[PDB]
Amino acid sequence: PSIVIASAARTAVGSFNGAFANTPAHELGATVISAVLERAGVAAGEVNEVILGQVLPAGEGQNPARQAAMKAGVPQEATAWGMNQLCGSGLRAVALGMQQIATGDASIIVAGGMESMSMAPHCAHLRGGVKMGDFKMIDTMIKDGLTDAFYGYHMGTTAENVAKQWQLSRDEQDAFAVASYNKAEAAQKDGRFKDEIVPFIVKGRKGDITVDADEEIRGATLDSMAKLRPAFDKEGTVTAGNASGLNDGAAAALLMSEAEASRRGIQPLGRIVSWATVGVDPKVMGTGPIPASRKALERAGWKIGDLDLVEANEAFAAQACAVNKDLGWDPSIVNVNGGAIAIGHPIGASGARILNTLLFEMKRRGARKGLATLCIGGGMGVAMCIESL
Amino acid sequence: PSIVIASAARTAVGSFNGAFANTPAHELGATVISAVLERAGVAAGEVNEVILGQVLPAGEGQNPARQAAMKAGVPQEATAWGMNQLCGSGLRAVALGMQQIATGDASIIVAGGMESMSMAPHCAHLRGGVKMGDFKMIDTMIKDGLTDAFYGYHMGTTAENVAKQWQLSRDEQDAFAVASYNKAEAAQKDGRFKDEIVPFIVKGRKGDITVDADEEIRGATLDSMAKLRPAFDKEGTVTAGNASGLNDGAAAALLMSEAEASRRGIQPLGRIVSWATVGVDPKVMGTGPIPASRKALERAGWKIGDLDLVEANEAFAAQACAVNKDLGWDPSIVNVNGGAIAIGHPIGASGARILNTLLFEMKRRGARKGLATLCIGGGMGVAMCIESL
Amino acid sequence: PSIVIASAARTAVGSFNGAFANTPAHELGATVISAVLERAGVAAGEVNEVILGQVLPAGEGQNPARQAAMKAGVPQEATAWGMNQLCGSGLRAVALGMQQIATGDASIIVAGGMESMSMAPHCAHLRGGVKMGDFKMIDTMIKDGLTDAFYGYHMGTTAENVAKQWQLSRDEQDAFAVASYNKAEAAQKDGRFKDEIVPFIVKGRKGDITVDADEEIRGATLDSMAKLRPAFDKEGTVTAGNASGLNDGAAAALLMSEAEASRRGIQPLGRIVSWATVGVDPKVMGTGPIPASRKALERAGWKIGDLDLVEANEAFAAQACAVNKDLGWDPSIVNVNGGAIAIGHPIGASGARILNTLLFEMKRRGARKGLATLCIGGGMGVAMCIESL
Amino acid sequence: PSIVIASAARTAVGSFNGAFANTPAHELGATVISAVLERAGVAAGEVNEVILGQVLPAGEGQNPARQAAMKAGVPQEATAWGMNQLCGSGLRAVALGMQQIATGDASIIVAGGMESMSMAPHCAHLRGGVKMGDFKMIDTMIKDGLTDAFYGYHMGTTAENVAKQWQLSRDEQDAFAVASYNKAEAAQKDGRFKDEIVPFIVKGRKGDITVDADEEIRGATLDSMAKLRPAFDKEGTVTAGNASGLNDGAAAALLMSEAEASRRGIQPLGRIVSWATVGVDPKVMGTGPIPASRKALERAGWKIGDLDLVEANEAFAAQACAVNKDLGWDPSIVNVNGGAIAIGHPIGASGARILNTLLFEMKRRGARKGLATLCIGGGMGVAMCIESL
Ligand SMILES: CC(C)(COP(=O)(O)OP(=O)(O)OC[C@H]1O[C@@H](n2cnc3c(N)ncnc32)[C@H](O)[C@@H]1OP(=O)(O)O)[C@@H](O)C(=O)NCCC(=O)NCCS
Ligand SMILES: CC(C)(COP(=O)(O)OP(=O)(O)OC[C@H]1O[C@@H](n2cnc3c(N)ncnc32)[C@H](O)[C@@H]1OP(=O)(O)O)[C@@H](O)C(=O)NCCC(=O)NCCS
Ligand SMILES: CC(C)(COP(=O)(O)OP(=O)(O)OC[C@H]1O[C@@H](n2cnc3c(N)ncnc32)[C@H](O)[C@@H]1OP(=O)(O)O)[C@@H](O)C(=O)NCCC(=O)NCCS
Ligand SMILES: CC(C)(COP(=O)(O)OP(=O)(O)OC[C@H]1O[C@@H](n2cnc3c(N)ncnc32)[C@H](O)[C@@H]1OP(=O)(O)O)[C@@H](O)C(=O)NCCC(=O)NCCS
Ligand SMILES: [Cl-]
Ligand SMILES: [Cl-]
């Protein structure tokens, strides 16, 4: 069978404790679900299932994916569930939703990801009681999202391991960072994000605020990156500038068979040709996209040179430089409008975020063969190949 | 294609703050993952992916499914992720794992569920700061697992609504409870749970303790159940006895193609013929399995009378009577060895728990056509049809 | 015997989460202790005991009064302790320190009060453990400082009771408020607070900041005060403007016998002639100063008309108007430089704050007979009479 | 003037999380206040002021001393306040109340101490917000009661400093421990605690329980105490047996002039002749009573040999041996009925607890000149001399 992406939308990537500081994840997910239905002309009463990836759902209630679907207008007859493959969750939900229609068990799937790292609460197991002494209040964002459970240190330390393993100097990593900021700043000015971004209405008590611009996009220079202190180790290279930040947002895509799009007169953004996921050593989780993209290309029967456009998520400057240096694809086609270093890294939603950036990127310049991939904590990677119709 | 279940295992369902009081979820998941590999003769280096459902992973670290696979012995080459469809998570992971091999994207899948409601922490959003006044510490088990996010009350209140519409007397619900305990009492005595249960070693500081028996099995009487006070409403019918409890445990199943099983000389427990999931009104979420089982049966080409054994999860006595009364299947084949009212309700693992109980019961008494289904909070249901080889 | 006040000092009253947001109470107290020693020519090695009132010391460590004395330079040979009579703590410590020298058990006492309501933590009894359900995180400032333990409502409700019992209109309370702001702002412009205020250096990571002005002194308007909604009752008269705020600060005074001051050539600010404390009904705790000041005046043998200057703490506009209406003293001599409505209300330190304001105003204009008094939560009041040497 | 102790009472010292696990301090204080009034024939409407020492009042509400007086029956006209000199609060409150009558400002004072270390909550300053990362939940009992704010370690470490500097072997410390337990067991068997102890009725949901016996009194052996591991240092000498525990309780005494007692026909337990408090190095806070008792004896004009009975609080076995070795008084008259090692150490109430034990023992065996003293955290000590009428 053939599965296409009829429409795709995403909210503007918000800053940590920024515009979406007090906005739950499912409310951001409800906006993109309603948006992909409007952009494709499909009614809510036709969605079979909603698949939204989310890593930090603590305190939001029973199944925020169902809450997002019901709030967006999807009726009670449909189903919904959340998945967690860390950073590659947003892209795997699209592949999982692709398999739902592939196995003949569904006809229309709204799949994507949503994440609100600002609303992540602090937790502590208190059922057994604390008879005496102090106890830690654990940050769910850091513990369940940003710390490798096998070695105990942050994901930035795994980037330091990649930097030591590939011999990536502080100047070479900062040079890759400023390139991402310069490509993202030009894209926001030229309006290359307006098609992907659906405006979100932050309902506040002191009036309403419309968010329709990635607020983590700033202007960095090569000298403003050499003054940043290392954020993870006292003798390291990864700083707050050459590393992706903590962000909120949501993204989704409307999936359907290739015959259904022709029946509805829908012109899909692209067709899902192949997907893949492979694991690596958690010490060097940043090398995840290397065998994942090659396995995706191997299943699609495509060479690396056949690709016309690449979206490789920039979790860190060290991991992004190695993947580009190793795969050897033309860096002029990788993250043409910037990357997660300049846009943001909403863990649950970043998988579908770079998919939105890629799908509209293939349409805007006439690219035919695209590829999106991300690195995953704990030593994993996911990749998907998209062809234009 | 054809997907079979080569092996299945489950831990004993532990009580709230009982044997697994201080045991993380992924440790229980590691035992079942390693068990299904031993019972089938498949090495750990052959698992492509691990799909484990889990509702309450707060404070356990990055992707507890990955931690369970690595601790069980699954190498770094494989991938892993967690899913959340509330109570139907344990069963949907099997269907999702079936689709991985169906689409030719995987060869060996270890799928199931794990949940540790005792290790569920209390949380509170504290990033924005508390300027003044008291703030609540939210229990993640109740909030993210046992409260409908659309009406705000407990799952027990939804059972009262099902009881009001289906005319289920106070005595008729207690009669279903004692029937579940008496069938569970006979199953534990006759040893019909020893094959499915894999022993877990609770390593404590005062020696080691082996857990290989469901510690929630007691002897209930009809008069000891009519004196229980309603635990959810001041004037109701749902009590602590006729409702599922808070429990810990894990369960899984090894998935593989039917040709691969014959090539390895494995005798599969059964073949996955059909699956389905549909949503219902959140007011009567206990009626989830009603439209789900018919959709699963219609895809398999089976009549309702064709089933030889049924495992319908007993979230509440009210919901179980309604699901049985509407489909009209012979009550002698539903939960022959007892149900969740007497065994326990590990949210993430209950979907695969009743699958293990069904698979080993179908094999020991020669049943050919089986069906497992559960109700899901928020108004959903999941069902799977299994045939024996 | 005769006990005089050789010197007195106070820190600038800081706003809630303002200049002293991250400054512990004992650090503010150490500055005032060092100040009263410099202004009197007495060394730190001569202080026999340090008595500092403090209402909210939770989480600050063992006996913050001892920490303030040690940090200020008082040697280990001396003693120190903290007391708690709520809002009258700052003034009762002076009377208690006066009794130390009166009974011949001490010769030089540094007495006063300190409070940091911004550093008040949230607490919860967790030793018995929370098996199930949510639990409240109790604000120590609200619970242990601003809530009557006999009727359960805020201290602002007791002001409403005083307003209802004394028939104090909303316009009369706001008129008293703007009068307090105008007297304090004009006093701050004319520099009538520089003598009392000792500058505090808030050592922050982004440089040092000197605080030498009560930062809650603002310009209020009658129309900007009549639009404020009542903060305690939905249909009431006490608002955030006509009520004292939550504030941080410290104040103290160096006590010594009248003969020792003449031996040291010190000109004391005043002599403590009489003191008194009496209790009232907790429903109308604002009437505390009424029988306390009358008992203090009778012990000194003074009539109400004999007073030349009065400092009656303005906890609320309702409580302050009632005290003036009952005692009947000339309002032109009460709070000449403003009150707690415009300066601030650090509960533990407010008792010594108005003492500093009274002592320095009596000295500059030649007043001989003064009286300071405050209302106390739970239905109490404290008052002290000061005569000039 | 002359101030006598007309009556005295105390609650049984409860164990940590024991009989008084859920009993607030002021409820224990209300029982002792009512008890000292009945034993002297004085009504509650005659008490001028209530002075209760308390170290851990976090979360109990506004001024727990006021709550204890009101619940015991003291009318609203009277006043009440709490003081905090750590371990010397219970005894210094008696001295402060003695000075109230000495300066002619009061006639009848109910003074003592109360402490409920089991009800001590965990706290954390959360107004400024936790931007990122984990934060500790501070135990108010450990932080504000048992940790030296100048060196950061527990009070047990100060005992280790005393033990190393005074040449006190670990076996000599354990030998002092069993002597305290054996003297307490014999005193409890012979009923020498019945006069001082007033029964407390713990009102629980499962019926009422009368507590009239110190539940921390057990039978210890020399070999069961020499096998205990040091609780403060990994290679130390202070164990859980030779150190005082965490306990709850309350104690008080009714103070009045010697002439007023004769007017009422009251036979006082003793007359307060002298009191004193002096500070020492916080490194060796256990040596507090050494210069404090010498100063108290010098104010009374008594030599050490003039004492007939001594109550020296046993905070630790190391500090108690050093105080006896330096002062050189006959150990046969010190703690005849046992000490805090076997009875308990309620911080706020220990000062008045050993006062009750001293007052009733001096009366029962005819002792004339007595002395009570305790060591105080942060490097202080307090002592009081009592003579018989
Ligand atoms: C690195 C990290 C800790 C930054 O945390 P942060 O401090 O709250 O973010 P900030 O923007 O405040 O960075 C701190 C400083 O750097 C500055 N800064 C950020 N980006 C900059 C840039 N491009 N140029 C210059 N300065 C920059 C900030 O303005 C700030 O200024 P300050 O010195 O006054 O504080 C966070 O982004 C991170 O850990 N990212 C990786 C997390 C993650 O998702 N890992 C998994 C990926 S798979
Ligand atoms: C978990 C649950 C049992 C809570 O009841 P509970 O009040 O917390 O149970 P308790 O903590 O009071 O302790 C268990 C009590 O039940 C009693 N009990 C348990 N099984 C019993 C039996 N078979 N016969 C008689 N009494 C029994 C115990 O003796 C105890 O009595 P007690 O209250 O006097 O001490 C249940 O009411 C519930 O809330 N389930 C929610 C989980 C859920 O939603 N499942 C469906 C998912 S859709
Ligand atoms: C009354 C109380 C709850 C105020 O709470 P608060 O909101 O945190 O204090 P605020 O100053 O921030 O009041 C908030 C609003 O009122 C405004 N406001 C405050 N004082 C004002 C004034 N004098 N004129 C005009 N506006 C004023 C603030 O600017 C703010 O407006 P905005 O936030 O809408 O822009 C608090 O001050 C209080 O409870 N005090 C009681 C003290 C007490 O009990 N003492 C012991 C009694 S013995
Ligand atoms: C010493 C201290 C750390 C121990 O706390 P604790 O361990 O909770 O006290 P416990 O009652 O639980 O004693 C626990 C252990 O010691 C043993 N123990 C206690 N008292 C004993 C005794 N009298 N004889 C023999 N063994 C004893 C217990 O049985 C247990 O050993 P176990 O593991 O074999 O069961 C704690 O009491 C403390 O900090 N005390 C200091 C109090 C203080 O500083 N007061 C102020 C003085 S200035
Ligand atoms: Cl002196
Ligand atoms: Cl009197």
How far apart are alpha carbons B307 and B389 in whole angstroms? 15
Reported as half-sphere exposure (CB side, CA atoms, 13 A), residue B265 has a value of 1
CB contact under 8 A, A124 and D136: no
The CA–CA distances, whole Å, from B166 to A176, B283, C59 equal: 65, 13, 56
Contact (CB, 8 A) for C87 and C351: yes
Kindly provide the residue ranges of all beta strands, DSSP E only, lying in B214-363, ordered along the sequence. Answer: 247-257, 270-279, 309-312
Atom 39 (ligand 1): residue with closest C-alpha?
A245
How far apart are alpha carbons D229 and D202 in whole angstroms? 34
CB atoms within 10 A of CB A160: 23
How far apart are alpha carbons D39 and D8 in whole angstroms? 8
Contact (CB, 8 A) for A137 and D137: yes
Q: What's the sign of the alpha-carbon dihedral D235, D236, D241, D244?
A: negative
Q: Which residues have CB under 8 Å from C388's CB, separation 6+?
A: C270, C271, C362, C363, C366, C367, C368, C369, C370
Categorise residue A197: left if φ over 0, alpha if ψ from -120 to 50, beta otherwise.
Answer: beta
Contact (CB, 8 A) for D348 and D90: yes
CB atoms within 10 A of CB C39: 17
Contact (CB, 8 A) for A196 and A159: no
Which residues does chain C break after (C to N > 2.5 Å)? none
Tokens of B96: 């999702």
If you ran DSSP here, which 8-state letter would residue A12 be given?
P
CB atoms within 10 A of CB C172: 17
Contact (CB, 8 A) for A385 and A296: yes
Expt. technique: X-ray
CB contact under 8 A, A127 and C128: no
Reported as half-sphere exposure (CB side, CA atoms, 13 A), residue A49 has a value of 26
Q: Which residues have CB under 8 Å from B139's CB, separation 6+?
A: B120, B122, C130, C132, C133, C134
How far apart are alpha carbons A73 and A67 in whole angstroms? 10
How far apart are alpha carbons C279 and B223 in whole angstroms? 58
Exposure string for D74-94, b = 16+ CB within 10 A, e = fewer = bebebbbbbbbbbbbbbbbbb
What amino acid occupies position C366? G
Categorise residue D2: left if φ over 0, alpha if ψ from -120 to 50, beta otherwise.
Answer: beta
Nearest-atom index, ligand 3, CA of C345: 45
D333: exposed, middle or buried (Cβ count in 10 Å: 0-12, 13-18, 19+) = middle
What amino acid occupies position B229? R
Number of residues that this document lists for chain C:
389
CA angle B62/B356/A52 to nearest 5° reads 35
**Does C345 participate in catalysis according to the annotation?**
yes
C267 in reach of chain D (CB within 8 A): no
Q: What is the dihedral of CA C223, C225, C226, C231, to 10 degrees?
A: 160
Exposure string for A61-75, b = 16+ CB within 10 A, e = fewer = bbbbbbbbbbbbebe
How far apart are alpha carbons A282 and B298 in whole angstroms? 44
What percentage of chain C's residues is helix, strand, coil (to nearest 5)? 40, 25, 35
D18: exposed, middle or buried (Cβ count in 10 Å: 0-12, 13-18, 19+) = middle
Reported as half-sphere exposure (CB side, CA atoms, 13 A), residue C232 has a value of 22
B76 phi, psi to nearest 5 deg: -65, -20
CA B277 to chain centre: 15
Q: What's the sign of the alpha-carbon dihedral B37, B42, B44, B50?
A: negative
> How would you classify the pairing of strands A207-211 and A200-204?
antiparallel
What amino acid occupies position A306? D
How far apart are alpha carbons C375 and B271 in whole angstroms? 80
Categorise residue C104: left if φ over 0, alpha if ψ from -120 to 50, beta otherwise.
Answer: left
Q: What is the dihedral of CA D306, D310, D312, D317, to 10 degrees?
A: 100
What amino acid occupies position B107? S
Contact (CB, 8 A) for A356 and A9: yes
CA B28 to chain centre: 14
In chain B, residues with a C-beta closer than 8 Å to the C-beta of C122 are 130, 134-135
Active-site choice (D87, D154, D321, D385) = D87
How far apart are alpha carbons C287 and C317 in whole angstroms? 12
A22 in reach of chain D (CB within 8 A): no
Categorise residue A343: left if φ over 0, alpha if ψ from -120 to 50, beta otherwise.
Answer: alpha
The CA–CA distances, whole Å, from C163 to B262, C170, C227, C236 equal: 89, 9, 19, 9
How far apart are alpha carbons C250 and C197 in whole angstroms? 10
> How would you classify the pairing of strands C49-53 and C108-116?
parallel
Q: Which of residues 40-79 of D touch A (CB under 8 A)?
A: none
C134: exposed, middle or buried (Cβ count in 10 Å: 0-12, 13-18, 19+) = middle
Query: Helix, strand, or coil here: C378?
Result: coil
Q: Which of residues 286-315 of A touch B (CB under 8 A)?
A: none
Considering only CA atoms, which of C338, C387, C382 is closest in space to residue C367?
C387
CA distance B127 to chain D (A): 5
Tokens of C188: 């701050």
CB atoms within 10 A of CB A191: 9
How far apart are alpha carbons D215 and D23 in whole angstroms? 15
C225 phi, psi to nearest 5 deg: -100, -25
- Structural domains of chain A, with CATH: 3-120+245-387 (3.40.47.10)
**What one-character-per-residue DSSP string does A103-171 give?**
TTS-SEEEEEEEEEGGGPPEEE--SS---SS-EEEEEHHHHHHHB-TTT-SBHHHHHHHHHHHHT--HH
Q: Which residues have CB under 8 Å from B203's CB, separation 6+?
A: none
How far apart are alpha carbons C188 and D280 in whole angstroms? 43
CB atoms within 10 A of CB B2: 13
Q: What's the sign of the alpha-carbon dihedral C281, C285, C286, C289?
A: positive
How far apart are alpha carbons B211 and A243 in whole angstroms? 46
How far apart are alpha carbons D40 and D37 in whole angstroms? 6
Contact (CB, 8 A) for A64 and A51: no
**Does A385 participate in catalysis according to the annotation?**
no
Contact (CB, 8 A) for B354 and B372: yes
CB contact under 8 A, D121 and C118: no
CB contact under 8 A, C126 and A130: yes
B263: exposed, middle or buried (Cβ count in 10 Å: 0-12, 13-18, 19+) = exposed
Kindly provide the residue ranges of all beta strands, DSSP E only, lying in chain A, ordered along the sequence. Answer: 3-10, 14-15, 49-53, 79-84, 108-116, 122-124, 135-139, 200-204, 207-211, 247-257, 270-279, 309-312, 369-376, 380-387
3-state secondary structure C228-269: CCECCCCCCCCECCCECCCEEEEEEEEEEEHHHHHHHCCCCC
CB atoms within 10 A of CB A50: 27
In chain D, residues with a C-beta closer than 8 Å to the C-beta of A131 are 17
B282 in reach of chain A (CB within 8 A): yes
Residues with CB under 6 Å of ligand 2 are B 87, 146, 155-156, 218, 220, 224, 231, 240-241, 243-246, 315, 345, 377
Q: Please, which residues bridge with residue D41 across strands?
A: none
How far apart are alpha carbons C64 and C82 in whole angstroms? 7
Block residue for tokens 């029937």: B179
Considering only CA atoms, which of D77, D307, D317 is closest in space to residue D180?
D317
Considering only CA atoms, which of A377, A361, A354 is closest in space to residue A91?
A354
How far apart are alpha carbons C227 and C221 in whole angstroms? 10
CB atoms within 10 A of CB D212: 13
Among the bound ligands, name the one nearest to the CA of residue D344.
Answer: 4
How far apart are alpha carbons B336 and A194 in whole angstroms? 59
Where do runs of H (alpha helix) occur along chain D?
Answer: 25-38, 64-72, 89-102, 140-146, 155-165, 170-189, 222-226, 258-263, 289-300, 317-327, 340-343, 347-365
Q: Which residues have CB under 8 Å from D226's CB, separation 6+?
A: D170, D171, D174
**Does C87 participate in catalysis according to the annotation?**
yes
Considering only CA atoms, which of C102, C44, C48 is closest in space to residue D276?
C48
Q: Please, which residues bridge with residue A256 across strands?
A: A4, A108
Contact (CB, 8 A) for D18 and D25: no
Mutation target among B127, B278, B281 for the A interface, most CBs of A within 10 A: B127
B142 in reach of chain C (CB within 8 A): yes
CB atoms within 10 A of CB D112: 37
What number of H helices and E strands is found in chain D?
Answer: 12, 14
Q: What's the sign of the alpha-carbon dihedral A198, A202, A206, A207?
A: positive
Tokens of A251: 């993204």
Contact (CB, 8 A) for B278 and B133: no
Nearest-atom index, ligand 3, CA of C376: 48
Query: Helix, strand, or coil here: B314?
Result: coil
A309 phi, psi to nearest 5 deg: -160, 140
Contact (CB, 8 A) for C61 and C54: no
CB contact under 8 A, D132 and A124: no
Nearest-atom index, ligand 2, CA of B218: 23
In chain B, residues with a C-beta closer than 8 Å to the C-beta of A92 are 81
Pocket test for ligand 3, best of C143, C155, C314 (most atoms within 8 A of CB): C155
How far apart are alpha carbons B150 and B281 in whole angstroms? 11
Q: Which residues have CB under 8 Å from D170's CB, separation 6+?
A: D163, D226, D237
Helix H or strand E encompassing C200? strand C200-204
Helix H or strand E encompassing C138? strand C135-139
